[PDB]
């Protein structure tokens, strides 16, 4: 139906304001700390601490599925892996200081990114 394709274009859409969010974020954080899912072969106790793992490929994989439905989909994902990584890493590790820094970054691009779906719907 015409209703549903109508749906479909505004997801797609969406998915292209939310890679270009995604594509800045990921430049707050240069060095790549969260570029990839932690290896359970160098991480061998990792999921008996975190039980919902992300990082920007799990991120980028999800959205060019267009498996982002809105904004509170998106940002739950980048609040987990600067979540995961505080709770994790203690607090003179630079791994909790760089989820810090993409935190108050990021910030000014998801208040930035808020104000972007919302009008353009
Ligand atoms: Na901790």
């Given at each position: 139906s015409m209703e549903?394709?109508?749906m479909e274009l505004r997801l797609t859409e969406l998915t292209?304001?939310?890679r270009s969010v995604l594509d800045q974020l990921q430049d707050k954080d240069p060095a790549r700390?969260?570029?990839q899912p932690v290896s359970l072969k160098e991480v061998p106790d990792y999921l008996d601490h975190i039980k919902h793992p992300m990082d920007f490929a799990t991120m980028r994989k999800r959205l060019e599925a267009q498996g982002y439905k809105?904004?509170?989909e998106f940002e739950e994902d980048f609040d987990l892996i600067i979540?995961?990584?505080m709770k994790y890493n203690?607090?003179?590790?630079?791994f909790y200081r760089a989820a810090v820094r993409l935190r108050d970054?990021?910030?000014?691009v998801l208040r930035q990114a808020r104000r972007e779906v919302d009008s353009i719907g």
């Open positions: 549903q394709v109508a292209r304001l939310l700390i969260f570029a809105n904004l509170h979540d995961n990584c203690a607090r003179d590790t630079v970054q990021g910030g000014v």
